[PDB]
Short mmCIF file of all heavy atoms in Angstrom, two decimals:
data_model
loop_
_atom_site.label_atom_id
_atom_site.label_comp_id
_atom_site.label_asym_id
_atom_site.label_seq_id
_atom_site.Cartn_x
_atom_site.Cartn_y
_atom_site.Cartn_z
N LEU A 88 29.61 19.02 -9.63
CA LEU A 88 30.66 19.94 -10.06
C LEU A 88 31.19 19.48 -11.43
O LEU A 88 31.51 18.34 -11.62
CB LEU A 88 31.78 20.11 -9.03
CG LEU A 88 32.75 21.26 -9.32
CD1 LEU A 88 32.11 22.64 -9.11
CD2 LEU A 88 33.98 21.16 -8.43
N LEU A 89 31.25 20.48 -12.36
CA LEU A 89 31.79 20.25 -13.68
C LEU A 89 32.96 21.08 -13.94
O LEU A 89 33.28 21.96 -13.09
CB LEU A 89 30.67 20.55 -14.79
CG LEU A 89 29.40 19.72 -14.71
CD1 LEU A 89 28.38 20.23 -15.77
CD2 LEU A 89 29.62 18.25 -14.87
N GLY A 90 33.67 20.85 -15.03
CA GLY A 90 34.87 21.54 -15.42
C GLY A 90 34.57 22.78 -16.23
O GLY A 90 33.42 23.17 -16.32
N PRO A 91 35.66 23.35 -16.89
CA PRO A 91 35.43 24.56 -17.66
C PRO A 91 34.63 24.33 -18.91
O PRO A 91 34.55 23.23 -19.42
CB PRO A 91 36.87 25.02 -17.93
CG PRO A 91 37.67 23.79 -17.93
CD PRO A 91 37.03 22.88 -16.90
N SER A 92 33.99 25.38 -19.36
CA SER A 92 33.20 25.41 -20.61
C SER A 92 34.06 25.31 -21.79
O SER A 92 35.28 25.57 -21.64
CB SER A 92 32.34 26.65 -20.71
OG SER A 92 33.24 27.73 -21.07
N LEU A 93 33.59 25.04 -23.03
CA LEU A 93 34.37 25.01 -24.25
C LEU A 93 34.92 26.32 -24.62
O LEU A 93 35.99 26.41 -25.20
CB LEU A 93 33.57 24.34 -25.42
CG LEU A 93 33.15 22.88 -25.24
CD1 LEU A 93 32.51 22.39 -26.53
CD2 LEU A 93 34.30 21.98 -24.78
N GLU A 94 34.24 27.44 -24.20
CA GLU A 94 34.68 28.80 -24.40
C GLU A 94 35.98 29.09 -23.50
O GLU A 94 36.94 29.59 -24.06
CB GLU A 94 33.60 29.84 -24.11
CG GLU A 94 33.99 31.29 -24.36
CD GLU A 94 34.42 31.71 -25.74
OE1 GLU A 94 33.98 31.05 -26.71
OE2 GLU A 94 35.13 32.71 -25.84
N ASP A 95 35.95 28.63 -22.28
CA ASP A 95 37.09 28.83 -21.34
C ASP A 95 38.24 28.01 -21.87
O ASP A 95 39.40 28.49 -21.85
CB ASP A 95 36.73 28.32 -19.93
CG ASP A 95 35.53 29.04 -19.28
OD1 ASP A 95 35.26 30.24 -19.61
OD2 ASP A 95 34.89 28.40 -18.42
N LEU A 96 37.99 26.77 -22.34
CA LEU A 96 39.08 25.93 -22.88
C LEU A 96 39.61 26.45 -24.16
O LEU A 96 40.80 26.36 -24.38
CB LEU A 96 38.58 24.47 -23.01
CG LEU A 96 38.28 23.73 -21.70
CD1 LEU A 96 37.36 22.55 -21.95
CD2 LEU A 96 39.61 23.28 -21.02
N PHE A 97 38.73 27.07 -25.00
CA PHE A 97 39.18 27.66 -26.31
C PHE A 97 40.10 28.84 -26.04
O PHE A 97 41.19 28.96 -26.66
CB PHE A 97 37.94 28.10 -27.13
CG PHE A 97 38.21 28.51 -28.55
CD1 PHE A 97 38.87 27.65 -29.45
CD2 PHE A 97 37.75 29.71 -29.05
CE1 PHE A 97 39.03 27.99 -30.79
CE2 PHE A 97 37.96 30.07 -30.39
CZ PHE A 97 38.57 29.18 -31.24
N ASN A 98 39.72 29.74 -25.07
CA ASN A 98 40.55 30.88 -24.67
C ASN A 98 41.89 30.41 -23.99
O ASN A 98 42.93 30.94 -24.34
CB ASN A 98 39.80 31.80 -23.72
CG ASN A 98 38.72 32.62 -24.45
OD1 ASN A 98 38.90 33.06 -25.57
ND2 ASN A 98 37.66 32.84 -23.69
N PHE A 99 41.78 29.32 -23.20
CA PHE A 99 42.95 28.74 -22.54
C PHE A 99 43.92 28.16 -23.60
O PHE A 99 45.12 28.17 -23.34
CB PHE A 99 42.56 27.67 -21.53
CG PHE A 99 43.65 27.41 -20.50
CD1 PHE A 99 43.72 28.13 -19.29
CD2 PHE A 99 44.57 26.37 -20.71
CE1 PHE A 99 44.69 27.85 -18.33
CE2 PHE A 99 45.57 26.13 -19.78
CZ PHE A 99 45.63 26.88 -18.58
N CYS A 100 43.43 27.71 -24.79
CA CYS A 100 44.17 27.14 -25.87
C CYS A 100 44.55 28.21 -26.94
O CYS A 100 44.86 27.82 -28.06
CB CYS A 100 43.42 25.97 -26.50
SG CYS A 100 43.36 24.55 -25.39
N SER A 101 44.54 29.48 -26.57
CA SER A 101 44.85 30.60 -27.44
C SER A 101 43.93 30.76 -28.71
O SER A 101 44.37 31.22 -29.73
CB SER A 101 46.33 30.60 -27.84
OG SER A 101 47.14 30.67 -26.66
N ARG A 102 42.67 30.35 -28.48
CA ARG A 102 41.62 30.41 -29.52
C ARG A 102 41.98 29.66 -30.84
O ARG A 102 41.69 30.06 -31.92
CB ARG A 102 41.20 31.86 -29.78
CG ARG A 102 40.78 32.54 -28.48
CD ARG A 102 40.35 33.99 -28.61
NE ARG A 102 39.21 34.09 -29.56
CZ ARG A 102 37.95 33.90 -29.24
NH1 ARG A 102 37.58 33.55 -28.00
NH2 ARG A 102 36.97 34.09 -30.10
N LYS A 103 42.66 28.54 -30.63
CA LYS A 103 43.03 27.62 -31.67
C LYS A 103 42.78 26.18 -31.28
O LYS A 103 43.40 25.76 -30.27
CB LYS A 103 44.49 27.84 -32.06
CG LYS A 103 44.89 27.37 -33.44
CD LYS A 103 45.65 26.04 -33.45
CE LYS A 103 45.46 25.28 -34.70
NZ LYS A 103 45.95 23.87 -34.58
N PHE A 104 41.93 25.41 -31.92
CA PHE A 104 41.68 23.99 -31.72
C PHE A 104 42.18 23.25 -32.90
O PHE A 104 41.85 23.67 -34.03
CB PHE A 104 40.21 23.66 -31.42
CG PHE A 104 39.68 23.90 -30.04
CD1 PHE A 104 38.29 23.84 -29.74
CD2 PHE A 104 40.53 24.15 -28.90
CE1 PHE A 104 37.81 24.02 -28.54
CE2 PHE A 104 40.03 24.33 -27.66
CZ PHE A 104 38.65 24.33 -27.46
N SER A 105 42.88 22.10 -32.71
CA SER A 105 43.32 21.27 -33.88
C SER A 105 42.04 20.67 -34.51
O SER A 105 40.99 20.62 -33.89
CB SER A 105 44.22 20.15 -33.38
OG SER A 105 43.53 19.33 -32.48
N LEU A 106 42.13 20.18 -35.73
CA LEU A 106 41.03 19.52 -36.42
C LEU A 106 40.53 18.30 -35.59
O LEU A 106 39.31 18.11 -35.47
CB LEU A 106 41.44 19.10 -37.82
CG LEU A 106 40.36 18.37 -38.63
CD1 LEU A 106 39.08 19.23 -38.80
CD2 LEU A 106 40.92 17.89 -40.01
N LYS A 107 41.46 17.54 -34.95
CA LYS A 107 41.08 16.39 -34.12
C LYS A 107 40.18 16.81 -32.94
O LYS A 107 39.20 16.12 -32.71
CB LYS A 107 42.34 15.58 -33.66
CG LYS A 107 42.02 14.37 -32.83
CD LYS A 107 43.22 13.75 -32.18
CE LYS A 107 42.76 12.72 -31.21
NZ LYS A 107 43.91 11.94 -30.63
N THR A 108 40.57 17.82 -32.21
CA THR A 108 39.76 18.37 -31.12
C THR A 108 38.33 18.76 -31.54
O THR A 108 37.37 18.40 -30.96
CB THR A 108 40.50 19.46 -30.33
OG1 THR A 108 41.47 18.83 -29.45
CG2 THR A 108 39.55 20.27 -29.41
N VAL A 109 38.26 19.51 -32.71
CA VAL A 109 36.97 19.96 -33.25
C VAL A 109 36.06 18.75 -33.58
O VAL A 109 34.92 18.82 -33.23
CB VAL A 109 37.15 20.91 -34.52
CG1 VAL A 109 35.82 21.28 -35.13
CG2 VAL A 109 37.94 22.15 -34.10
N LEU A 110 36.61 17.68 -34.11
CA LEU A 110 35.88 16.51 -34.50
C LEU A 110 35.49 15.68 -33.29
O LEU A 110 34.44 15.09 -33.29
CB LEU A 110 36.69 15.70 -35.59
CG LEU A 110 36.99 16.50 -36.89
CD1 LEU A 110 37.88 15.63 -37.81
CD2 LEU A 110 35.70 16.99 -37.60
N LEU A 111 36.36 15.60 -32.29
CA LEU A 111 36.04 14.90 -31.03
C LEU A 111 34.83 15.67 -30.44
O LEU A 111 33.88 14.97 -29.93
CB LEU A 111 37.23 14.86 -30.08
CG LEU A 111 38.31 13.86 -30.39
CD1 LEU A 111 39.52 14.01 -29.38
CD2 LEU A 111 37.88 12.49 -30.36
N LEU A 112 34.92 16.94 -30.37
CA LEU A 112 33.84 17.78 -29.86
C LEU A 112 32.56 17.68 -30.66
O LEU A 112 31.51 17.57 -30.11
CB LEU A 112 34.29 19.26 -29.65
CG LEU A 112 35.37 19.49 -28.62
CD1 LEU A 112 35.85 20.97 -28.67
CD2 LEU A 112 34.91 19.15 -27.17
N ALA A 113 32.67 17.77 -32.03
CA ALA A 113 31.50 17.74 -32.91
C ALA A 113 30.64 16.45 -32.65
O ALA A 113 29.43 16.49 -32.55
CB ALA A 113 31.91 17.78 -34.34
N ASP A 114 31.31 15.27 -32.58
CA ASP A 114 30.69 14.00 -32.34
C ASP A 114 29.75 13.99 -31.12
O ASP A 114 28.54 13.55 -31.26
CB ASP A 114 31.75 12.85 -32.25
CG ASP A 114 31.12 11.48 -32.23
OD1 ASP A 114 30.48 11.12 -33.31
OD2 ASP A 114 31.22 10.76 -31.26
N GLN A 115 30.26 14.47 -29.99
CA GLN A 115 29.55 14.49 -28.71
C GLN A 115 28.50 15.55 -28.69
O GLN A 115 27.39 15.31 -28.15
CB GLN A 115 30.59 14.75 -27.56
CG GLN A 115 31.39 13.50 -27.27
CD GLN A 115 32.01 13.56 -25.89
OE1 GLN A 115 31.32 13.79 -24.88
NE2 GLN A 115 33.31 13.50 -25.78
N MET A 116 28.78 16.71 -29.26
CA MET A 116 27.82 17.89 -29.24
C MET A 116 26.57 17.55 -30.08
O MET A 116 25.48 17.96 -29.71
CB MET A 116 28.55 19.17 -29.71
CG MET A 116 29.59 19.66 -28.74
SD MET A 116 30.70 20.86 -29.45
CE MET A 116 29.88 22.32 -29.12
N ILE A 117 26.72 16.81 -31.24
CA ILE A 117 25.60 16.40 -32.08
C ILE A 117 24.69 15.48 -31.20
O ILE A 117 23.42 15.56 -31.25
CB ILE A 117 26.03 15.79 -33.43
CG1 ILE A 117 26.81 16.76 -34.39
CG2 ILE A 117 24.79 15.25 -34.19
CD1 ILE A 117 27.60 16.23 -35.61
N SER A 118 25.33 14.57 -30.50
CA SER A 118 24.65 13.58 -29.64
C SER A 118 23.88 14.24 -28.50
O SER A 118 22.79 13.82 -28.20
CB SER A 118 25.60 12.60 -29.11
OG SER A 118 26.12 11.80 -30.18
N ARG A 119 24.50 15.26 -27.85
CA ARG A 119 23.79 16.05 -26.77
C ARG A 119 22.53 16.68 -27.28
O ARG A 119 21.53 16.65 -26.66
CB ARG A 119 24.70 17.15 -26.22
CG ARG A 119 25.97 16.64 -25.49
CD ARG A 119 25.75 15.60 -24.43
NE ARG A 119 27.01 14.90 -24.20
CZ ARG A 119 27.36 13.78 -24.80
NH1 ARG A 119 26.52 13.17 -25.56
NH2 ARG A 119 28.59 13.29 -24.64
N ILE A 120 22.66 17.31 -28.47
CA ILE A 120 21.52 18.00 -29.10
C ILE A 120 20.46 16.99 -29.51
O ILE A 120 19.25 17.19 -29.25
CB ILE A 120 22.00 18.84 -30.32
CG1 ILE A 120 22.79 20.08 -29.80
CG2 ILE A 120 20.82 19.28 -31.15
CD1 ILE A 120 23.54 20.92 -30.87
N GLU A 121 20.84 15.81 -30.03
CA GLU A 121 19.92 14.79 -30.44
C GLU A 121 19.15 14.31 -29.19
O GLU A 121 17.91 14.09 -29.31
CB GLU A 121 20.65 13.57 -31.11
CG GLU A 121 19.70 12.45 -31.41
CD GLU A 121 20.34 11.28 -32.14
OE1 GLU A 121 21.57 11.22 -32.23
OE2 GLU A 121 19.58 10.36 -32.61
N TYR A 122 19.83 14.10 -28.08
CA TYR A 122 19.22 13.69 -26.79
C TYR A 122 18.17 14.66 -26.33
O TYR A 122 17.07 14.28 -25.95
CB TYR A 122 20.28 13.45 -25.70
CG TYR A 122 19.62 12.93 -24.46
CD1 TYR A 122 19.24 11.58 -24.39
CD2 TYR A 122 19.30 13.73 -23.40
CE1 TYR A 122 18.55 11.09 -23.27
CE2 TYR A 122 18.59 13.25 -22.28
CZ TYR A 122 18.20 11.92 -22.21
OH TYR A 122 17.53 11.45 -21.14
N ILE A 123 18.47 16.00 -26.35
CA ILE A 123 17.55 17.02 -25.90
C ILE A 123 16.28 16.97 -26.80
O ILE A 123 15.18 17.01 -26.31
CB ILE A 123 18.25 18.40 -25.89
CG1 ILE A 123 19.27 18.48 -24.71
CG2 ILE A 123 17.24 19.56 -25.78
CD1 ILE A 123 20.35 19.45 -25.06
N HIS A 124 16.49 16.89 -28.16
CA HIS A 124 15.40 16.75 -29.07
C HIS A 124 14.57 15.48 -28.86
O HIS A 124 13.36 15.53 -28.96
CB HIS A 124 15.94 16.70 -30.50
CG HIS A 124 16.62 17.96 -30.93
ND1 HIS A 124 17.34 18.08 -32.11
CD2 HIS A 124 16.63 19.23 -30.32
CE1 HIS A 124 17.73 19.37 -32.20
NE2 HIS A 124 17.36 20.05 -31.10
N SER A 125 15.23 14.34 -28.47
CA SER A 125 14.49 13.07 -28.19
C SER A 125 13.56 13.25 -27.00
O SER A 125 12.60 12.53 -26.82
CB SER A 125 15.43 11.90 -27.98
OG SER A 125 16.01 11.92 -26.68
N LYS A 126 13.87 14.25 -26.14
CA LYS A 126 13.13 14.57 -24.94
C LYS A 126 12.14 15.75 -25.18
O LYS A 126 11.64 16.38 -24.18
CB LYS A 126 14.03 14.84 -23.72
CG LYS A 126 14.84 13.57 -23.32
CD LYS A 126 13.95 12.52 -22.68
CE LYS A 126 14.43 11.12 -22.96
NZ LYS A 126 13.99 10.18 -21.93
N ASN A 127 11.86 16.05 -26.46
CA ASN A 127 10.80 16.99 -26.95
C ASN A 127 11.16 18.48 -26.74
O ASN A 127 10.28 19.33 -26.89
CB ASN A 127 9.39 16.64 -26.37
CG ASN A 127 9.20 15.24 -26.24
OD1 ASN A 127 9.39 14.42 -27.17
ND2 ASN A 127 8.92 14.75 -24.99
N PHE A 128 12.41 18.80 -26.50
CA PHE A 128 12.87 20.15 -26.28
C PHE A 128 13.90 20.56 -27.30
O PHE A 128 14.68 19.71 -27.76
CB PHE A 128 13.47 20.28 -24.84
CG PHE A 128 12.45 20.56 -23.79
CD1 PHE A 128 11.76 19.49 -23.18
CD2 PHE A 128 12.11 21.81 -23.44
CE1 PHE A 128 10.76 19.74 -22.22
CE2 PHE A 128 11.12 22.09 -22.46
CZ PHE A 128 10.45 21.03 -21.84
N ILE A 129 13.95 21.85 -27.60
CA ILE A 129 14.96 22.50 -28.40
C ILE A 129 15.71 23.42 -27.46
O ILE A 129 15.10 24.00 -26.54
CB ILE A 129 14.52 23.22 -29.70
CG1 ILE A 129 13.28 24.15 -29.41
CG2 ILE A 129 14.22 22.22 -30.85
CD1 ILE A 129 12.94 25.06 -30.56
N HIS A 130 17.10 23.42 -27.50
CA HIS A 130 17.91 24.21 -26.58
C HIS A 130 17.81 25.72 -26.80
O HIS A 130 17.60 26.41 -25.84
CB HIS A 130 19.38 23.72 -26.69
CG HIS A 130 20.24 24.25 -25.59
ND1 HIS A 130 20.86 25.52 -25.71
CD2 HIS A 130 20.58 23.71 -24.44
CE1 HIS A 130 21.52 25.61 -24.54
NE2 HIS A 130 21.40 24.59 -23.74
N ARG A 131 17.95 26.12 -28.10
CA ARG A 131 17.83 27.49 -28.57
C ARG A 131 19.01 28.44 -28.21
O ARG A 131 19.00 29.63 -28.59
CB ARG A 131 16.46 28.14 -28.22
CG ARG A 131 15.28 27.40 -28.80
CD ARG A 131 14.04 28.29 -28.89
NE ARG A 131 13.61 28.81 -27.65
CZ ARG A 131 12.58 29.68 -27.48
NH1 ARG A 131 11.89 30.09 -28.54
NH2 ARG A 131 12.28 30.11 -26.25
N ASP A 132 19.99 27.96 -27.46
CA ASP A 132 21.17 28.76 -27.14
C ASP A 132 22.43 27.94 -27.23
O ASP A 132 23.23 27.88 -26.24
CB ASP A 132 21.03 29.56 -25.81
CG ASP A 132 21.92 30.73 -25.80
OD1 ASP A 132 22.43 31.19 -26.83
OD2 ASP A 132 22.20 31.28 -24.65
N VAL A 133 22.64 27.31 -28.34
CA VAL A 133 23.80 26.46 -28.65
C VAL A 133 25.01 27.40 -28.89
O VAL A 133 25.00 28.12 -29.85
CB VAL A 133 23.54 25.44 -29.77
CG1 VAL A 133 24.79 24.68 -30.14
CG2 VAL A 133 22.43 24.52 -29.40
N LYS A 134 25.93 27.36 -27.95
CA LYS A 134 27.18 28.17 -27.98
C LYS A 134 28.24 27.53 -27.10
O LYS A 134 27.83 26.74 -26.24
CB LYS A 134 26.85 29.62 -27.47
CG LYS A 134 26.27 29.73 -26.01
CD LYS A 134 26.06 31.18 -25.63
CE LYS A 134 25.56 31.31 -24.22
NZ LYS A 134 25.52 32.72 -23.79
#
Side-chain angles (χ1 to χ4, degrees):
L88 190 70
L89 302 175
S92 74
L93 298 187
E94 183 57 26
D95 302 333
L96 292 160
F97 191 58
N98 287 323
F99 201 91
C100 292
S101 299
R102 305 181 57 85
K103 201 258 153 192
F104 279 167
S105 61
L106 178 59
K107 181 188 169 175
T108 282
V109 176
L110 300 177
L111 283 175
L112 292 174
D114 190 63
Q115 285 199 56
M116 292 164 91
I117 294 166
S118 295
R119 294 309 159 266
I120 291 171
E121 176 177 11
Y122 184 76
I123 290 155
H124 294 170
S125 78
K126 296 291 148 156
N127 323 310
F128 275 84
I129 48 169
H130 192 273
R131 299 204 299 179
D132 202 17
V133 175
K134 60 180 183 171

